[PDB]
Amino acid sequence: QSVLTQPPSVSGAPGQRVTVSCTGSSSNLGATYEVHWYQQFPGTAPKLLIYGSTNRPSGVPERFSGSKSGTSASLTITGLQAEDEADYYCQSYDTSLRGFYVFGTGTKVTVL
Template sequence: MSWAPLLVLSALCACSKAQLVVTQRPSASVAPGGTATVSCSISTGTIGDGHYPRWVQHIYGNVPRGLIYNTNVRPEGTPARFSGSRSGNTMSLTITEVEPQDDASYYCVVWAGSSSHSDTVPWGRETKTLNLRRCC
């Protein structure tokens, strides 16, 4: 049987102190073994190091885990087929050679504060889910 992955937009959050709004592109499909790109944009300015751009993966039933941080740094345990990039006001997560275990929610996270990092100030975030469904 084959798997047909489908990217589905599942949530939107407009957060915070700087009135930063984070949005993601509409859903898209990718064939098994193919490449999936998940992107999100901020409403004002460009995404820089001070936004601490990161991607979080949440596989249903498991604890969410950091997948990419500082745009393109993979922590230990993140396969090389996951990569991050940014350009202007957009950041992207690319997954090459998509596999069934990639069935998860992917959160794009950017810092919305105007000064130093603090967990008490909200982060802008957007969720995109990679759903793998049996086909045929």
């Protein structure tokens, strides 16, 4: 389940570019599945931020863009704003154990 490794914390000054990594295995991504990202604020449900590794939902700022290569993936936040402090999670599909959806461990992104 909590198998996509993410750093526990990412940080930088407002206006800076920071990234959140997501590392999978062969069953997840290595089996050509995509990475999805969610932005969760305390008190609410996570919302979709990125899908299909690189695409944005309508309403998501240009600051957020992701990518995937090999068995790793990442979310780039460029130009951190105070409103971006949040719990970020990566999601994919793992083919082992008869198949399941997985999430990463989560990253706290802090604006300094």
